[PDB]
Design a protein around this ligand. Structure first.
Ligand SMILES: [Mn+2]
Ligand SMILES: [Mn+2]
Ligand SMILES: [Mn+2]
Ligand SMILES: [Zn+2]
Ligand SMILES: [Zn+2]
Length: 460
């Protein structure tokens, strides 16, 4: 009556056979799980990656979090800095005492249902001002991955798991994650993040950059409670949230200024947005699918690790996402077309199903590019010059108007040195007549078709 828990998301228990290839497995469950946005994956009983670390030598700078529903929070502070510092031990001592004192109970006697119910009570009650702390950072020397990494001499147990597809360190380089081919720096997106949780520390409603998948592993500790919404209902959810908290939707000039919030799943459910839940326990995986909104909170002291990835399934959505970013004037993490062309240029060493799928996206790219160039020629842009867009830092090749990262082409004018617009915004560069403009382009149409043909040959 005050909190009605959403229905449970799918839970999968793959055999060692199914578990052997994560991408094949994820492809298998996709028809089911994309309907719920998140799913939980239980590895085979004996898949037990060894965790070991010194709780006194691992330190991190804590982030502070107020717990008020609908209140604005900023997504990531990928740079911590800070003066406050916990070791894993001192944070754990703080975390356990907090939970223990909050409920006046020992921590594993506090029922998960109760913590959940209480969480939604405290975030909605205005004069409760509970604040908590948490850790969130990419792997570093002061704090590294929870999975085995090859360096230091390792035990045969760690060696068995060193190359596992489910070892999340391996997805920044695994063959069928399209992100692995990106030569551009996308560190904040490609490397695993480490999260140290405590009771009620939470992650606001969000979707991944470029609508990528994510996969989260809870190494140890108390559970992590999740809420998930399927990709098809993304705009539904956004409409509900814009109505209840429009501040979050004002434009901001950074990827370092994305605004997000806590919001009761019952609110979404009242507005007919489908929402699912799960308690992720130690040793379990949660997977989020493209454009699946998700949020949640930790039940107590714990340690999780997560990473983004992109399968070939995702390529058309990646293209749609950047188009969606353009309409919103949202910054890109990388150029999707640049990634496509990078892959085309490596067609011979590409996996063959990958090659086939890249070829299809490239064909759309080329077709759209052809049409755009015809339009800008008709606007009176005549001069042109080839330009190696991939050499420019990102902040020197964003469209003035829509902020998209240019790669296929842009318009410049000697009137405004260094400024560029994409071909959707030829009118937005300056007041000079179009005959003063240059079309800057990475490839001629004639360069492009042979690149696509290499993919076709590789794929047959
Ligand atoms: Mn409150
Ligand atoms: Mn996420
Ligand atoms: Mn516009
Ligand atoms: Zn533009
Ligand atoms: Zn000009």
């Amino acid at each position: 009556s005050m909190f009605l828990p959403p229905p449970e998301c799918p839970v999968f228990e793959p055999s060692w056979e199914e578990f052997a290839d994560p991408f094949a497995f994820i492809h298998k469950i996709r028809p089911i799980a994309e309907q719920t946005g998140i799913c939980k994956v239980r590895p085979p009983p004996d898949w037990q990656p060894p965790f070991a670390c010194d709780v006194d030598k691992l330190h991190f700078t804590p982030r502070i979090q107020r717990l008020n529903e609908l209140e604005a929070q900023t997504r990531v502070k990928l740079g911590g800095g800070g003066a406050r510092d916990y070791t894993l031990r001192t944070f754990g001592e703080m975390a356990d005492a907090f939970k223990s004192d909050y409920f006046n109970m020992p921590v594993h006697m506090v029922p998960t249902e109760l913590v959940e119910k209480e969480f939604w009570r405290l975030v909605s009650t205005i004069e409760e001002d509970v604040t908590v702390e948490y850790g969130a950072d990419i792997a570093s020397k002061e704090f590294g991955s929870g999975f085995p990494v090859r360096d230091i001499k390792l035990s045969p147990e760690e060696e068995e798991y060193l190359d596992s597809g489910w070892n999340l360190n391996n997805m920044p380089v695994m063959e069928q994650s399209v992100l692995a081919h990106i030569t551009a720096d996308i560190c904040g997106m490609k490397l695993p993040w480490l999260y140290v949780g405590m009771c009620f520390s939470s992650f606001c409603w969000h979707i991944e950059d470029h609508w990528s998948y994510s996969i989260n592993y809870l190494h140890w500790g108390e559970p992590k409670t999740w809420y998930g919404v399927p990709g098809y209902a993304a705009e539904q959810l956004e409409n509900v949230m814009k109505k209840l908290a429009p501040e979050l939707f004002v434009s901001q000039p950074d990827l370092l200024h994305q605004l997000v919030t806590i919001m009761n799943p019952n609110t979404l459910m009242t507005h007919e947005v489908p929402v699912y839940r799960t308690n992720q326990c130690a040793g379990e995986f949660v997977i989020t699918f493209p454009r699946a909104y998700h949020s949640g909170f930790n039940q107590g002291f714990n340690f999780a690790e997560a990473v983004n990835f992109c399968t070939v399934d995702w390529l058309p959505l990646g293209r749609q996402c950047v188009e969606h970013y353009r309409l919103l004037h949202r910054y890109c993490v990388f150029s999707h077309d640049e990634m496509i062309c990078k892959m085309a240029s490596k067609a011979d060493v590409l996996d063959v199903v990958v090659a086939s799928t890249v070829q299809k996206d490239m064909a759309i790219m080329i077709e759209d590019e052809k049409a755009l160039r015809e339009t800008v020629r008709k606007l009176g842009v005549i001069d042109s010059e080839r330009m190696d867009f991939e050499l420019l830092p990102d902040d020197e090749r964003q469209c003035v108007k829509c902020k998209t990262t240019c790669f296929m082409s842009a318009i410049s004018c000697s009137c405004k040195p260094g400024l560029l617009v994409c071909l959707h915004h030829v009118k937005e560069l300056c007041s000079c007549p179009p005959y003063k403009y240059k079309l800057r382009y990475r490839y001629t149409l004639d360069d492009l078709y042979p690149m696509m043909n290499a993919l076709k040959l590789r794929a047959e």
